[PDB]
């Protein structure tokens, strides 16, 4: 018959990285997590307690609860034609701070700095990111860079 156990099909997912076995470094346990923080889930195979299910591998959520050695995380899961809220109790070994928004904080700080700098004299501070734009015109000099002619080469075996 078929087999659909809890850790089914996780042969490679939960393995340790090459030459990275053994105990966890202490910086994992020294980080602080607060309600509202954004974390991403990556299970560690050497810690069998408080381990997430394989579905949540590589997912990102928001902390809603803090306990002695674990945190509570909220994940939106697509079931059928809708999304359901899932709450996970995970030990800190299996999570880390997400940088998908930590990089966004500095853009907020820089926007305030640029707004205040131009507040006294400037208008239209233009605090909006823009996509890559088409290149403008330029002049290409041939001084010391005379074009080299190329031609297709004949077929050769050289086996």
């Amino acid at each position: 018959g078929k087999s659909h156990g809890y850790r089914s099909r996780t042969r490679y997912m939960f393995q340790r990285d090459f030459r990275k076995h053994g105990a966890v470094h202490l910086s994992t346990y020294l980080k602080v997590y607060k309600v509202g923080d954004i974390v991403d889930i990556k299970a560690n195979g050497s810690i069998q307690k408080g381990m997430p299910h394989k579905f949540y591998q590589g997912k990102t959520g928001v902390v809603y609860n803090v306990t002695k050695s674990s945190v509570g995380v909220i994940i939106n899961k697509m079931v059928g034609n809708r999304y359901l809220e899932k709450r996970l109790n995970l030990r800190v070994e299996h999570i880390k701070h997400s940088k998908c928004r930590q990089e966004f904080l500095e853009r907020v700080k820089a926007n305030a700095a640029k707004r205040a700098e131009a507040k006294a004299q400037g208008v239209a501070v233009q605090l909006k990111r823009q996509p890559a734009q088409p290149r403008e015109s330029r002049i290409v000099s041939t001084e010391g860079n005379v074009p080299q002619t190329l031609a297709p080469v004949p077929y050769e075996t050289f086996i």
């Binding site: 041939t142 005379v146 074009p147 002619t149």
Partner: protein, 51 residues
Amino acid sequence: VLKKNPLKNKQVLLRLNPYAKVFAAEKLGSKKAEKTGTKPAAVFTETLKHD
């Protein structure tokens, strides 16, 4: 009640774009270009004809 196409109905072409009358009177559609005399450098010509 009936869309009339400018560039074939002159009155409609004048209702919009009053500059059309000035454009036609001065023949701005056949404006002569000022003559120049710049010539390509020897490197440009020898590269164009190079094998």
